[PDB]
Amino acid sequence: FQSDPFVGSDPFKDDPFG
Amino acid sequence: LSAQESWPVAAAITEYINAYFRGGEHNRCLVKITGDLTMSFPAGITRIFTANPNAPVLSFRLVNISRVDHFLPNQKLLYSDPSQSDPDTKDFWFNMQALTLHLQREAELNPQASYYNVALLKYQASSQDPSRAPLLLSAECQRSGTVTRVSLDYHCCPATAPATQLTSVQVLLPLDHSATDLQCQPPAAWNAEERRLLWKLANLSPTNHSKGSGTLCASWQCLEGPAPSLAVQFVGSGASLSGLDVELVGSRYRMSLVKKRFATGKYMAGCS
Ligand SMILES: [Zn+2]
Numbered sequence: 001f002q003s004d005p006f007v008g009s010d011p012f013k014d015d016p017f018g
Numbered sequence: 019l020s021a022q023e024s025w026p027v028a029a030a031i032t033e034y035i036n037a038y039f040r041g042g043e044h045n046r047c048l049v050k051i052t053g054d055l056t057m058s059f060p061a062g063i064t065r066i067f068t069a070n071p072n073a074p075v076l077s078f079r080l081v082n083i084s085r086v087d088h089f090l091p092n093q094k095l096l097y098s099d100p101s102q103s104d105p106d107t108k109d110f111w112f113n114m115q116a117l118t119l120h121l122q123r124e125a126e127l128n129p130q131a132s133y134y135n136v137a138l139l140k141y142q143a144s145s146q147d148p149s150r151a152p153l154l155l156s157a158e159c160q161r162s163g164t165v166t167r168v169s170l171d172y173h174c175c176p177a178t179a180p181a182t183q184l185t186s187v188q189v190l191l192p193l194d195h196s197a198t199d200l201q202c203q204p205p206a207a208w209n210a211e212e213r214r215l216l217w218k219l220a221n222l223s224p225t226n227h228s229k230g231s232g233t234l235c236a237s238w239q240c241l242e243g244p245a246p247s248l249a250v251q252f253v254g255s256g257a258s259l260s261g262l263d264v265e266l267v268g269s270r271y272r273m274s275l276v277k278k279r280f281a282t283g284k285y286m287a288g289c290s
Pocket of ligand 1: 175
C-alpha cells in the first residue's frame with residue numbers, strides 16, 4: 001500500500017483520450 | 019480537437035481499519051476506519067489547462083456518506099456549499115486556476131510521469147457496532163499451571179463484510195522464545211525476529227459459510243503480564259469498508275476508473 005494508489009500503473013493507458 | 023473531447027480523470031479510495039475485540043463475556047468491539055480520496059489526471063490535461071484558464075469546472079459528489087463521521091477536504095484546491103444539509107451526499111467543485119498551477123508544478127517536478135495524483139479528502143469513521151467490521155473475531159484464553167491455551171474463532175460475515183474477498187490473511191500471536199511444548203492446530207510458524215506465531219489463512223469470502231468461518235488455537239508451557247492478544251492482517255480490493263463512493267457531476271469530464279482498496283491497521287482480538 002504505497003502512496004501512489006495507481007502503483008506506477010497508468011489508469012489512462014487504455015483510455016481513448018488523445 | 020483535444021479541446022472539445024470529454025476529458026478523463028480517475029479516483030482512488032483507500033481505507034485502513036483498526037479494530038479491537040475485547041473478549042471476555044460480551045466480546046465488545048471498537049472499529050476505526052481512516053480513508054483517503056485521491057484523484058489522478060492524465061499528463062496531457064495540463065496543456066489543456068495552461069492554455070485555457072477558462073477551462074470548465076471539474077465537479078464531483080460523495081455518496082453513501084452517512085457512515086462517515088468527519089471530512090477534511092483539500093482547501094487549497096476545492097470549494098463546497100456549507101448550506102448543503104444533505105446527509106447522504108456532498109458536492110465539491112475544483113478551483114480551476116489553483117488546480118492548473120498545481121498540475122503545472124507536478125509536471126515541472128516529474129516531467130516523465132504520464133499522470134499526476136491529487137489528494138482530495140481525508141475522512142474517519144468510528145463505531146462500537148461490530149457490524150462495521152468485516153471480520154469478526156472471538157478469542158478465549160485458559161491457563162492451568164504452566165500451560166497456556168489460546169484459541170481464536172473468526173467469522174467473515176455477509177452482514178458485516180463488503181462484497182469481495184479478504185486476501186493476504188494472516189493471524190499473529192506473539193510468543194516469547196522461552197516457550198516450550200508448542201502445539202498448534204492448524205500448524206503455525208514461529209518468526210524468530212518478531213517472536214510471534216504466524217498462521218497463513220486461505221482467502222476469506224462472505225459468500226460461503228465454509229469459505230468464510232474458521233477457528234485456530236495454540237498451546238505452550240512457560241516456566242514463569244496481561245493475556246496475549248492476536249493480530250489479524252488482510253487486504254481487499256473492489257469495495258470500500260465505509261461505503262463511501264465518488265461520482266462526477268456533469269458530462270464535461272468522465273471517470274476513467276475508481277480504484278477501491280483497503281487494509282488492516284492494528285486489528286486485534288483480546289481474551290480474558
Ligand atoms: Zn455473521
